[model samples]
Target: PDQRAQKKGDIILGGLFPIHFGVAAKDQDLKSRPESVECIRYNFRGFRWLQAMIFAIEEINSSPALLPNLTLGYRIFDTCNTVSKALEATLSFVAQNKIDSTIAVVGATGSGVSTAVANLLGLFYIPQVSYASSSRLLSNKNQFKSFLRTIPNDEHQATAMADIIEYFRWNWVGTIAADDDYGRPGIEKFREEAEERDICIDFSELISQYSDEEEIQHVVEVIQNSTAKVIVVFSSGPDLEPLIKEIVRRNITGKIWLASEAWASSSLIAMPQYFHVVGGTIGFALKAGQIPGFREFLKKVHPRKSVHNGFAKEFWEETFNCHLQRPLCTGDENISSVETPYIDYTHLRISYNVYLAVYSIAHALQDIYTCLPGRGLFTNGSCADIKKVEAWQVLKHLRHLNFTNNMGEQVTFDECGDLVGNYSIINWHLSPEDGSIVFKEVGYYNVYAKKGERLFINEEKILWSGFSREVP
Candidate 1:
């Protein structure tokens, strides 16, 4: 409540993002009240997604085609990638007041965080659309009736990972997970899919975002001692960053790394030093598309211009490595000079999903406000009065929301509130000019196709680690 983005509107939309990767756990003192979490590991991707939400809101407010008369208000909060933190934010969204009672929400980032939030949001029938979180357990409509996502579910991704491994004829492989709802269930479903194809797993290790030293050591040792040549890791980028760091430290080499959709194209894990170990890595990534005005909209973000957006100052100060109040570090640093991911809008993957989420909500709102009398969705065919609309009224429209965005993609959801499983098979390759990591699309996986014909791969075009396609 102290430092969130806010403004008044006819209907206020809530948002939750892991602007920071995770929190520093406080030392619990039973004698006194516990302190709130201290956020760490500033996530540029989540911040970009946050801005995308603002970008969409701004676009809709000015457009005469959508929600022209009613203004859309928003209260965006940082989830800090924790269930407890997300729950507290969810509580604020439900309470009625000048600041509470949101009609719909866009995100919470991780599947684990969304699961906890979904349990509460569904009870109240508040629609929650996620941009990144994609676990199969969340697909159970009986459990998460209000949960929907722009990102495809893990079931499609898990099968794709298995098919990739099978393509390489790696019958015996090792597997790793993040030890959370996202990784564990994803790998569980993957294991089922793999075993059915006669692919035996040599090892299954679990890692954490908190960066546990002992478990990390154990995982590296398992990789060192195992006979498996290929390893599949079901983890988000930051959660797997530490484990990869340890692998590099130990001078491990010649192992083929297979990524889950979580870290397939993550910027955090695509570092130069780790490329020697993870190069030629192949995994399923969410399909990416270009947003017409998004690149220019990103450049317009300035600290002094957005006094209400508390993250802008922090993003600029951190990106430039300078303080606003101090010299030798100009507060006037421009985005044009920097070579960071913030300004690099070349691959707007998750951020595009966030943009779609906002538009979906707006379209649902449009449907609600235009409901004619005696021909409405409600019983007795009575239309809901726009001024006297309940938050739940918007929820009904979102289940069947369908429209074409500026990108011209069909925006809709299935009965269980999940997107059709669509993914791009990405291969990590070095650029010929600079040797920097480039995420090259090697193929695609569409769930609509036949079982054997589902995965389309160009194996000859692929390059494995050590810069050659040869394997042991």
Candidate 2:
């Protein structure tokens, strides 16, 4: 069993009387993963109740004047094996409804997020929009128009890491990244960018599928042998725990630790075992809590309620509290007394940003329609006005259109429909006593500011191209 379904399989959803809304209830019973044995379990009956409530609201607002519902479902399966089951369910719903021209959203639980999106964009022939899915090529540089995303891509993240690593002149760098789509892409992108800056990937370790202690130890040994003083971790929240624990057990220290956006969290490093081993971690985040609109999104969006875990609550919290806003989500401020673990009562943030990202894409289509010469489809105009617009032109226009949840400041689309801005670096301090382990925000990068601003990188060079396909 995976992390969420580690224990006896159960699905939790809450409903008041007849109203129902919630995540899919896990009916099959299964053993829990030891690492995720202690997570809270809720019945999906209540969540179903909430879904019913949303249905009722949708019904109430079902007047002809209101646009017809463009309901889309997002998948949340834990492992590679379960992806087909989830996607089949979603596709079944799509076929039953004959829902063509509708954007489909699907992604892997944690590290496989980018792979999920890329495959969907390349294989499904369906336009995709993601709020939280961040890959290096999904943005303007990649030039994937049908593939639109709201968050900053990992390329910017790689650039930031390179900038910081180069700043410190850290020639020997090692990486222990998750065995997922995001990990390798980020590592590769970082390595590629570093090549331009004369940096080399000395020693790199890819964590295992399950990510056990022995696997981490092997990675540590490789790093130790390489004499690398800098290490980058590309795993997710739970996966970080065991790696750090093993590092501490082996008495590792005095290295500059780095992390991709996935592992950048105070909670990941909070465990006492990693107080000394984890020198620091680099991560990217958004100021979700500070945004009032996201709070509203929390109140309004039904599925955004709490569908998945592995930090599901954090995902929701981060959506509303951080990414859309300026400062973005950072780690806990006070790290005194490791026992307390600095609980900030702030809700966790996760993939709802991806949902909203799809929404923005739909709206962009709407914008396209308005500019075209059409009847009964917005008397204002047709999609031609927007279609004729250049990448920079469209981006400038989108910068001001804010989604209600205070989710994104703008929906600027480059040649590819990726959004700018919605990224930052966050740190979670796990140990205060010795300052032994501190997840630090060593680097932060946003493509909006960097685009056309960098002095060396070719401004006109088309960064990347999506899989070529023609709409039938």
Candidate 3:
């Protein structure tokens, strides 16, 4: 049953966000059927993405120029960063009760989740636009025709990572990846790229959030005992946390860590304690820009204002260390007053993709709305009725969507439903005074640049892992 009022409208958009990073699957001991899986590890970054989708839909609904006489709504599903949950959540989108129902989806963060969702959505011809999933596995147009992503594919990222290492003349390097689609494919391409450049990989490792302590300790020892000076890591924040905790515990130092886009600017790894371990770490971040009025949307999120939202209530308690009750819990704390990592609209990387995903749907729907007969793509050049738009038609316009985004930048999709390999190189360092993580943009990498010029760097600006200016 459709309960949310604002989330129901003339057009209902589907959103898949990793609201929780970890999923707790319980085994039923000879019970009837298995119960629902429990999701843990509240993720603020993914929450902002959920907010961004609603914000875009709200803005589009308010605009009379786009999709006139129509309102857009969203039914968000939590992925929990698991492929099984993502697939289960996606099933709810297709078994709907309306003709103009959930025709398009906005997310599914990791590549493995996207791969599963896209394959399933392809059966229904429902478009699935990913916000942060980047893997060469999803690059096949023949298989994933209805898939598109705002984030650049990992081939470009692998090229940039390999180029950065090659430019520095580092031959002995180590590579680590998460045991998922996002990490494995990216790491494989990076291996090939490095091999072609004669860059010898000293050791390779795979890590995950579920890895045992013995495996993590062994990985730390591998890094500690290896001759590789540069370590390239392609993994999410939660998966890399245990390994990093062990590395810091063993007091490992002097090794330059190259971060992937998954953890480049993530607060999960940017804590003060890791300043010694990842001080001079470098990585690529995708599409950094602020979505106007997004911060205000975030500020107004309180337990009292959004009591129906369980996530907001949990976020307020977690941030202010207070509850909705009296004394130890007022629930009146302001999110804008905090300097912690939870609140902020800037550095809008992943959220930016979610923003664009909503707008892409809007623009496509508008194109269908204003479409005239005898010229449309239908068999008789007939346009789809706005009230009963089909799933495939929305995907038709989405695959060819090339409009200017809210950021005033022209965005389009390639033949493979991927954006150009565009990225900003970021260097992680610590502030001298309070010792907070400082992300400095060191350079750029554009795959479409002429003169065969793609990679750029400011070596003088990069401080190494030991906080030393000298390169290892």
Query: Candidate 3, TM-score vs. the true structure?
Result: 0.93
Worst-scoring 10-residue span by lDDT in model 1: 324-333
lDDT by residue (1-472, candidate 2, tens digit) is: 2322111111111111100111232343556542222223232222222222233223323433322332322223322222333343334323422443223333323324444434434433344445445655455434343355556567677677777667657787887776665677788888887888898778877874356567777876886687787777766554465566666777876666766666664355554556455533445665442322333333333223333323233333333343422455343322222232212324334334433443443344345434436532333533334323322223323432344433334445555555555455544444446643444332345455655343222112211111112211
TM-score of 2: 0.58
Task: Report residue 138 deviation for candidate 1 (angstroms).
Answer: 0.9
Over 4 Å off, model 1: 29-32, 97-100, 326-329
Model 1 deviation from native, Cα RMSD in Å: 2.0
What ordering of candidates by TM-score runs from best to worst?
A: 1, 3, 2
Question: Who is ahead in lDDT, 1 or 3?
Answer: 1
Instruction: For model 3, state the Cα shift of residue 304 in Å.
Output: 3.2
lDDT of 1 by residue, 1-472 (tens): 5557877888888999888888886667778776676888788878888989988998889899888778988999998888888888888998773243588998888999999999988888899999988988888999998989988888878888888878778888999999899999999999999988999999999998775688889999999999987899999988898899999999888778889978877888887788888888888877776777878888887888886578887788778877776444565678888777777657778898898999899988898888888887888987777787776788888887888877767878988888875788888998888778888888999889888788999877788783787645
- Show where candidate 2 strays beyond 4 Å: 1-85, 97-103, 106-125, 137-146, 212-214, 287-355, 361-372, 375-408, 427-472
lDDT string for model 3 (1-472, tens) is: 2211134587788888887788764656955776677787778777777878888888887888988888887778778898888877777888763233587889889898899989888888899899888898898988997898888889988888999988888889999999999999989999999988899999999999889899998898899889887999999998898888888888887778888999988788888897777787889988676688877777788776764345666676667767566347666666777665556534777888888888888888888888888988777888888888888999888877779976678888888888875789988888788677788888989878862378999988887763668653
- Return the top candidate by TM-score: 1
